[PDB]
Amino acid sequence: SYTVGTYLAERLVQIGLKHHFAVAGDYNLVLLDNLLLNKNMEQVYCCNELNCGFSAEGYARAKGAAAAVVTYSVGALSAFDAIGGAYAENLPVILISGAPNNNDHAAGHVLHHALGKTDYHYQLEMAKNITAAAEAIYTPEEAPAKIDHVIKTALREKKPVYLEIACNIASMPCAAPGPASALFNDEASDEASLNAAVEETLKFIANRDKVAVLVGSKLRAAGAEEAAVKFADALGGAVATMAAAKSFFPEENPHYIGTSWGEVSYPGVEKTMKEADAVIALAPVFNDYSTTGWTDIPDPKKLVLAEPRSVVVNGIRFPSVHLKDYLTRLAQKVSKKTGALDFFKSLNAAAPADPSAPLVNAEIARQVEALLTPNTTVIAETGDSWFNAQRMKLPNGARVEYEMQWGHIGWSVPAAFGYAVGAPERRNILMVGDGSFQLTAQEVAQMVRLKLPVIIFLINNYGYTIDVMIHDGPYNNIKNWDYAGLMEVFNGNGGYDSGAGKGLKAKTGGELAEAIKVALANTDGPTLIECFIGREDCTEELVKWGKRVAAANSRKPVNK
Amino acid sequence: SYTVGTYLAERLVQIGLKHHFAVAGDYNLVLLDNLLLNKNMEQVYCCNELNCGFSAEGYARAKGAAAAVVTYSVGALSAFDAIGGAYAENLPVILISGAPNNNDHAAGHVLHHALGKTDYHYQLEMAKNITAAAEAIYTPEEAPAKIDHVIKTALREKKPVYLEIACNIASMPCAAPGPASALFNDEASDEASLNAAVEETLKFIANRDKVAVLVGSKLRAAGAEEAAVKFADALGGAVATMAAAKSFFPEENPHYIGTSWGEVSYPGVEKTMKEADAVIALAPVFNDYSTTGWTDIPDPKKLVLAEPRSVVVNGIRFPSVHLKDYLTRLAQKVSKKTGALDFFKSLNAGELKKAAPADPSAPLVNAEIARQVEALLTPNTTVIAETGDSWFNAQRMKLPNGARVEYEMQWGHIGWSVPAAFGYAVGAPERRNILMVGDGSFQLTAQEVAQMVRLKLPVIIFLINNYGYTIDVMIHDGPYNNIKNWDYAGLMEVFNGNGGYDSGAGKGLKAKTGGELAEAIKVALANTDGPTLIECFIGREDCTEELVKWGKRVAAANSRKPVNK
Amino acid sequence: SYTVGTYLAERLVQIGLKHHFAVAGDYNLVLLDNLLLNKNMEQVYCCNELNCGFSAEGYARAKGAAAAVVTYSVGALSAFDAIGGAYAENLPVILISGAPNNNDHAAGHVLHHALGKTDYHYQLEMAKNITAAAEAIYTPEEAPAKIDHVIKTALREKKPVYLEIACNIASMPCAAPGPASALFNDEASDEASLNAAVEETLKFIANRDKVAVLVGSKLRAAGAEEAAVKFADALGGAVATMAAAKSFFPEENPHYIGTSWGEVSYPGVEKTMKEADAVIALAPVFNDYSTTGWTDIPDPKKLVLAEPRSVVVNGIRFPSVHLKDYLTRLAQKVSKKTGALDFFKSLNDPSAPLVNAEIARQVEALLTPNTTVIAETGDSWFNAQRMKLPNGARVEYEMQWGHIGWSVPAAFGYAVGAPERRNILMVGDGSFQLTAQEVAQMVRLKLPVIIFLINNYGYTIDVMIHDGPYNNIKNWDYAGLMEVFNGNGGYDSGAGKGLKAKTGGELAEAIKVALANTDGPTLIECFIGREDCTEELVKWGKRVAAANSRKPVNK
Ligand SMILES: Cc1ncc(C[n+]2c([C@@](C)(O)C(=O)O)sc(CCOP(=O)(O)OP(=O)(O)O)c2C)c(N)n1
Ligand SMILES: Cc1ncc(C[n+]2c([C@@](C)(O)C(=O)O)sc(CCOP(=O)(O)OP(=O)(O)O)c2C)c(N)n1
Ligand SMILES: Cc1ncc(C[n+]2c([C@@](C)(O)C(=O)O)sc(CCOP(=O)(O)OP(=O)(O)O)c2C)c(N)n1
Ligand SMILES: [Mg+2]
Ligand SMILES: [Mg+2]
Numbered sequence A: 001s002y003t004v005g006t007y008l009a010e011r012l013v014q015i016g017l018k019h020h021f022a023v024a025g026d027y028n029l030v031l032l033d034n035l036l037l038n039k040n041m042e043q044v045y046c047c048n049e050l051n052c053g054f055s056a057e058g059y060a061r062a063k064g065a066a067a068a069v070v071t072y073s074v075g076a077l078s079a080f081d082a083i084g085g086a087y088a089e090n091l092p093v094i095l096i097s098g099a100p101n102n103n104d105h106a107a108g109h110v111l112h113h114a115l116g117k118t119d120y121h122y123q124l125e126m127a128k129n130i131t132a133a134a135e136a137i138y139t140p141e142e143a144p145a146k147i148d149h150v151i152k153t154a155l156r157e158k159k160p161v162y163l164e165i166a167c168n169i170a171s172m173p174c175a176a177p178g179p180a181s182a183l184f185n186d187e188a189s190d191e192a193s194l195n196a197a198v199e200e201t202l203k204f205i206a207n208r209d210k211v212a213v214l215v216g217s218k219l220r221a222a223g224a225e226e227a228a229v230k231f232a233d234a235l236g237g238a239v240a241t242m243a244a245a246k247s248f249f250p251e252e253n254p255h256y257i258g259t260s261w262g263e264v265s266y267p268g269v270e271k272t273m274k275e276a277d278a279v280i281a282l283a284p285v286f287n288d289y290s291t292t293g294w295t296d297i298p299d300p301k302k303l304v305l306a307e308p309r310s311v312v313v314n315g316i317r318f319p320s321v322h323l324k325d326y327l328t329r330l331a332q333k334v335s336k337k338t339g340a341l342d343f344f345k346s347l348n349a350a351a352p353a354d355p356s357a358p359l360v361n362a363e364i365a366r367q368v369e370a371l372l373t374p375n376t377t378v379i380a381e382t383g384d385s386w387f388n389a390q391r392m393k394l395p396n397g398a399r400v401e402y403e404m405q406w407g408h409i410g411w412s413v414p415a416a417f418g419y420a421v422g423a424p425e426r427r428n429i430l431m432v433g434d435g436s437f438q439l440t441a442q443e444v445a446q447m448v449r450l451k452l453p454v455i456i457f458l459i460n461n462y463g464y465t466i467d468v469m470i471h472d473g474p475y476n477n478i479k480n481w482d483y484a485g486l487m488e489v490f491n492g493n494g495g496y497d498s499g500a501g502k503g504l505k506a507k508t509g510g511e512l513a514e515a516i517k518v519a520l521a522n523t524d525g526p527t528l529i530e531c532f533i534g535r536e537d538c539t540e541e542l543v544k545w546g547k548r549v550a551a552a553n554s555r556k557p558v559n560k
Numbered sequence B: 001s002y003t004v005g006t007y008l009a010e011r012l013v014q015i016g017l018k019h020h021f022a023v024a025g026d027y028n029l030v031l032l033d034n035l036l037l038n039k040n041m042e043q044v045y046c047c048n049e050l051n052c053g054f055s056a057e058g059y060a061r062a063k064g065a066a067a068a069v070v071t072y073s074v075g076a077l078s079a080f081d082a083i084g085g086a087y088a089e090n091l092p093v094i095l096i097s098g099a100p101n102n103n104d105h106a107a108g109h110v111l112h113h114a115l116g117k118t119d120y121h122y123q124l125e126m127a128k129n130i131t132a133a134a135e136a137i138y139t140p141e142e143a144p145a146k147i148d149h150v151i152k153t154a155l156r157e158k159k160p161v162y163l164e165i166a167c168n169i170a171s172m173p174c175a176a177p178g179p180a181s182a183l184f185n186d187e188a189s190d191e192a193s194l195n196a197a198v199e200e201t202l203k204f205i206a207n208r209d210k211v212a213v214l215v216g217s218k219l220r221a222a223g224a225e226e227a228a229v230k231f232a233d234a235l236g237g238a239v240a241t242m243a244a245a246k247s248f249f250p251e252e253n254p255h256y257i258g259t260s261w262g263e264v265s266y267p268g269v270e271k272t273m274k275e276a277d278a279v280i281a282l283a284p285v286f287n288d289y290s291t292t293g294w295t296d297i298p299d300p301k302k303l304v305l306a307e308p309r310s311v312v313v314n315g316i317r318f319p320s321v322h323l324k325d326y327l328t329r330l331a332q333k334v335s336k337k338t339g340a341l342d343f344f345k346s347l348n349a350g351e352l353k354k355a356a357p358a359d360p361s362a363p364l365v366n367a368e369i370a371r372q373v374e375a376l377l378t379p380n381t382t383v384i385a386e387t388g389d390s391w392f393n394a395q396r397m398k399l400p401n402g403a404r405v406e407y408e409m410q411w412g413h414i415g416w417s418v419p420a421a422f423g424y425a426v427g428a429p430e431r432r433n434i435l436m437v438g439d440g441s442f443q444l445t446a447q448e449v450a451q452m453v454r455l456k457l458p459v460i461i462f463l464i465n466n467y468g469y470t471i472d473v474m475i476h477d478g479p480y481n482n483i484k485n486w487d488y489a490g491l492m493e494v495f496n497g498n499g500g501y502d503s504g505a506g507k508g509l510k511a512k513t514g515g516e517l518a519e520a521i522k523v524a525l526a527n528t529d530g531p532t533l534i535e536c537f538i539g540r541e542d543c544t545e546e547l548v549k550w551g552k553r554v555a556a557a558n559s560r561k562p563v564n565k
Numbered sequence C: 001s002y003t004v005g006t007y008l009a010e011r012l013v014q015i016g017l018k019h020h021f022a023v024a025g026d027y028n029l030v031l032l033d034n035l036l037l038n039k040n041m042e043q044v045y046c047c048n049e050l051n052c053g054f055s056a057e058g059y060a061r062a063k064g065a066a067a068a069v070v071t072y073s074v075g076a077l078s079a080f081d082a083i084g085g086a087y088a089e090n091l092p093v094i095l096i097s098g099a100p101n102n103n104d105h106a107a108g109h110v111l112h113h114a115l116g117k118t119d120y121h122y123q124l125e126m127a128k129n130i131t132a133a134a135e136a137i138y139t140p141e142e143a144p145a146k147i148d149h150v151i152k153t154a155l156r157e158k159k160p161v162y163l164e165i166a167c168n169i170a171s172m173p174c175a176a177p178g179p180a181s182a183l184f185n186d187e188a189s190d191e192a193s194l195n196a197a198v199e200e201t202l203k204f205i206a207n208r209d210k211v212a213v214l215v216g217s218k219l220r221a222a223g224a225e226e227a228a229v230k231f232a233d234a235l236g237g238a239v240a241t242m243a244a245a246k247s248f249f250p251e252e253n254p255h256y257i258g259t260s261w262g263e264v265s266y267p268g269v270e271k272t273m274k275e276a277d278a279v280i281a282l283a284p285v286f287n288d289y290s291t292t293g294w295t296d297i298p299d300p301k302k303l304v305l306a307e308p309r310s311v312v313v314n315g316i317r318f319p320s321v322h323l324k325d326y327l328t329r330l331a332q333k334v335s336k337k338t339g340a341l342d343f344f345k346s347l348n349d350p351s352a353p354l355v356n357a358e359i360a361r362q363v364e365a366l367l368t369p370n371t372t373v374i375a376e377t378g379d380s381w382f383n384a385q386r387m388k389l390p391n392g393a394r395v396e397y398e399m400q401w402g403h404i405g406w407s408v409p410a411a412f413g414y415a416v417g418a419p420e421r422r423n424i425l426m427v428g429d430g431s432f433q434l435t436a437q438e439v440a441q442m443v444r445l446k447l448p449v450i451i452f453l454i455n456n457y458g459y460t461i462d463v464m465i466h467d468g469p470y471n472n473i474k475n476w477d478y479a480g481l482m483e484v485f486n487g488n489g490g491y492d493s494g495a496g497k498g499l500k501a502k503t504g505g506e507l508a509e510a511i512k513v514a515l516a517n518t519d520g521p522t523l524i525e526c527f528i529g530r531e532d533c534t535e536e537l538v539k540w541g542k543r544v545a546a547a548n549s550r551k552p553v554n555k
């Protein structure tokens, strides 16, 4: 029948996973063995556990959920960083750690990979801090309930969870997994609440014709993107996206006005939000970065707060209401409120050089924007890449992935890898700076391994420019690499296996243009285009936003 | 006057740090500034936070202590893995994380780099699990006492500690640090307990002729290496080192019989240990690895447990006794108990069976590699030996007095060796620094070699390319033991970036025969302005006989079925 | 041969304990048996775990340290309240819990007294939050090191520690304990640091004639009481005690100017502290209560901060300096700075119903050099504070933790540790009701504790902070409770006495009865009015209310 391992494998398959990512270790080899018995899933290996985790995170952006398997302690602790990331970004990533032989608890035993103490619950306890659920499986009999609990929890809450599994029980017999349908079983919206929430919104915007819709970075987590479009079309008001919510709303929609992000919003959008009589925020995340150093806070007395599972409106809080239902209902009964849109229309709100000239930041953004199609996904790394990506016009169906809540530089590399494994057919573009690329560069080797065509724009401006614009110092300088040259190293052509990765250098617009052509044709492996630009040549947005962030960060203690 | 930052800076200088490692982030930028104000220390930057943590770890092996600075959450959480490592390896690494503005607590503020909630004590709480002390600093006034405490704790317990500093107080005035001596102030040995412990050992060994001394991996942490030599000479007994304690005892010493590691011990050693009437364990760590899958466990009745700060002997436990003091006094009082050594030599077991120089034009084999590397070992040489077959190759090498081996056998995080070798090289410029690392492990942390290139460190790197995780193949083999091959040699010019924004003098070389290996080695030694990577090609099955035997044991112990409880 | 249990027992005797407190459970029965084998120590039993813990805490005030033994979970968690208390009050109380059979870990076993889950580390983890050290012992071999470790930590840091022991290993063999001296083995003051700290203090006060000395509540933890008196006499300056430090300095010493507590200080004191050029603070704890709602904060420009193990003076911090040494060597080198004390000097019905002032007056009259007054949270804080102590008399305050009801178990534990002393307990009705059952143990062991139960019908201290129906209680015949605890005419025996006092005469008469009752405790139920409290309480209470309700500040 089933084992602890094959039970887990079946559950992962049942949730939609076609892959899981792993780094082998003696505490998880038998588990990995068991996972391999499943004929509906592949096992994908990574260089290290940080990357293994971010790879699952990128996979979950593509598939909805993901799984990573590491070894006890030496494997798990670094992965925890990625799991914290998955919590911050609302992605159900399942981390499974190998664990000690069950006989080793309360035994006076010191084990390898651990602290040198005799107890082994510290990993589990750390994990509880950064997950929606965390369970330790010490016996075969308890496996089914714990796996089911953590999986159901991850799916309902759109958050990562933790499982550890004693290495000697991986092949032990246990109960069979029931229907996949049970795993997705959530509660329906409380009818009385949904109705009142809608009625209060209609009452709220009855004498407020200037209605704006603020799209938030939790919109996808709530699976209410489609619903948001219906409402917007019915409302006929202006729709703005928060920076992190880019591509969560169709930009070719006639109601879309661009990015809201304080002083660095799209032209006119900032004024449009302050003129709005009502702001209906759809699954928003308000933090020090999205508010631009706290300079852009929404007015509470005109804000409708439509979170993924609750709605606050007209001074009443309505829990137990799914955003998708809320939006669908409101769409059907809402009247036209086009005031904010008309206003924006009435508003009245870099300079290119030739391809035979030193490459500049604005020329890169342009050529990348020209590559965008409804089948494209852009992975935007923390750095100026955030701002360049944000300024691009997205054809309906084009996606952009941001990690603006966690903001772990280096994320974009293994994430692009994981995402590509999950969406091989898409045009996958990775926009990443040299600074970030160095933390996790090696995962590009796995793109080479799996023959994943990923187009990598490596922005070599020789250091951490985004930090240069927040607060400069010697700590913003790095060792430059021959980034284009790394690809052949990863190919290893000359050793054993093989690789069709390509590394190109771009020092002018013409070169970048040719390099891009080569990248598009290279569908056999990734293509890294090393773009050379100046440290100071960044978006104007970064410079302004950076000053706000720096001011926010350093503001003096307030007497308590 | 002082600031939170410069106070920390001063304390670090005071404990003997000449560098501290860092990865910048807005939560630590002002802190880095303040640290830079103190010119008695250099600020060394790392690619990522895991390496930054292991780089400090390596530095602590070279200098006794170290410090890494990271940014909140995204920086600290991965660094925790290395910090956990410093705990398991008994190294006082000080992890300082930048932290949220102090006004953002109990404010309903969601901040970047965090979980998306409005509280920020989770990192502190996680860190308490892997440190001997962890303190958050939220105001300037509290900074002095917390800094002093963690640092004092680090030094005394020989464990890593944790500090976090609100980003807006780094540059705020605080009281000035006092005398440096106050940081090293530790209790002395309780005189009565020291004397009783020595007396009870004398009584215990009075009629136990065959006395063996087993050197443990916590010996250097206790600072008792020199005293151990004194005691060993006065005892005249057999001295064996546990696997993890290689280089912790002089191998040229006439009392040294080699490695005690169960069925994979040096010839005659396994028999000698079981024949001994008394085993004096010096700062040991008995775990599932050092015991060869629990097959080699010391006899509790014949065991004298001389720990760093306590001795259990003749059925009595004596806390508050420094190992250094214990061994120093025992040395003065002990009589010659040569029984065990006599037995060892009479075994006539000979010495480790080593291969002769291979035909230089013959395909390269594991044994040839180990031979040529061993010939590079000298008094001022240090070999960093990565988890993998490198453990066993390194274990087999004969060390001239002064030669050091660095193992991470408790934590065992593959890839540790690369950042560690960097940190160690920064702290030990006057040694020949060698790194023996497998292809599999190298891939976790390879980018830190670029920092070696950056700081022009002449590290010699033997990259063992056997196309995968051999050590795991010898425990339990599966597809998960294969990796994507790299042109490791070629990686060196990438890190140089010659023709780019800067430069580098690293060299990458390939060796497929003994002859090539020898030539590559000559080149390595001649390259003085940067690290040299020698890519050694050998077969996956071409590994030590020791690994195969050890791997079988480990596998069986890991997989043994649950016991009815 | 020793066992895990007998190893702990011997360590406890070695640190000076003559008693340990316990409440039996199936998780600790065998452990308790092993502890009983040592005849240098009595096992003392309690009504419940909170009181058992607070009993240990009170014992630690008299003996220097103590131990409490409880059963897993149901026993440990409530005791955690009293351990947290021991941490706040800087007392080395060792809490030992019974624990599951070591076979029940990682076995999928659900066990009684637990949460219904199959894991059993939650108690240990909760413990780490409120202790200086926490160790779970699962095998006999690991016992000596963990036992030695927590006990040494307790003695060093003057904080509580935690131990749990698998129920099935208590009587199993382990190494024998070495010499007791190892337990108190602590570091010495760094010489360079001690010498430097003294010199900066001399330099700091060289030109500042008006030196005041502020005595803090951690003075006893630092064991610097005797050294403080040497310093004071050598200095000749003004000496004052913060509220929680009452009796940590001889009130008959000519340098003593009384209590420093902001607008509720002794007459002249608040002004002299402001007039003083330099304030030498000996191990102070500055909190919202000791600062009178943050209204009375020391000026950091004139402040010398001498903590138990560090001194901050003239903007320099000196760690690894024992306060005892600092004061001793400072006393040997300091010259007269009398300005502060000089300044202070020239600044300044028997049958009718009973009032608070009368109770206070008669209690004060009972104070002797052999007396210890346990003062409960309530108006009792302020009544005790206002009393003049003969040199030698002691006052016990739980002013950091402030758990009402603390006083009954603490008084019991304190009396067990110091039977020779005249043990007085000042407790209000409200507080008494949380822990009143431990008076049965005073009876049981024939401890002549004199209890002044202040029956003002409700929580008056809370009345004077912020009033509401929640400050009202159900009244008891408190006096009558004594005969209930005696159980005379039932199973065992009891010599407790309960009396009612509604007038001064009735109070004085019950006090004589209390004095003549040497075979058991004496509860004197004093009837006063809810509003009939100290003026200090009304002032302090106001400042405390204001601090607590301060509006959130911005950003
Ligand atoms: C794991 C980790 N470590 C450090 C950082 C800090 N950090 C940044 C922030 C935004 O998180 C920040 O400063 O707060 S941004 C940043 C530099 C990114 O440099 P790149 O070269 O990739 O970007 P640009 O030069 O801006 O194109 C660093 C190191 C980080 N974000 N994540
Ligand atoms: C961070 C991390 N991840 C995974 C491992 C598991 N792990 C190992 C052990 C020691 O833990 C083991 O399984 O025994 S060994 C190992 C592979 C090492 O392969 P190398 O190519 O460097 O060694 P050789 O092939 O033996 O020369 C891995 C991945 C590990 N030790 N650390
Ligand atoms: C276990 C516990 N529960 C509640 C309290 C709160 N609490 C007090 C304070 C001072 O701690 C406070 O209000 O902050 S004081 C107090 C009532 C004390 O009433 P008593 O009747 O004993 O004192 P008086 O009426 O002043 O004689 C309570 C319940 C407390 N201190 N401890
Ligand atoms: Mg850059
Ligand atoms: Mg290998």
Ligand SMILES: [Mg+2]
Residues within 6 Å of the ligand: C428, C429, C430, C454, C455, C456, C457, C458, C459, C460
């Ligand atoms: Mg009352």
